[PDB]
Nucleic acid binder design. Structure first.
Length: 59
DNA sequence: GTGATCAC
DNA sequence: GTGATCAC
């Protein structure tokens, strides 16, 4: 699904930013919690990167 | 090792 | 076809 709320992330360029992820999803093996991942675009570079989402971010 | 995703 | 994202 696509994100709605902004997320506090560290961009690849090394800066803190508040970005809305274009896609969010859960990545987890059987039996374990795994992690929530967002796909973000660095507005400074236009480069795409992934980053952990807060555990309560809605998928 | 195992899980999903997609820009490259 | 995979880098890179994390937690357990």
């Amino acid at each position: 699904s696509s994100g709605k709320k902004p997320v506090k992330v560290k961009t690849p360029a090394g800066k803190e930013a508040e970005l809305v992820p274009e896609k969010v999803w859960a990545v987890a093996p059987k039996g374990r919690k795994g992690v929530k991942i967002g796909l973000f675009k660095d507005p400074e570079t236009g480069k795409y990167f992934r980053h952990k989402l807060p555990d309560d971010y809605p998928i």
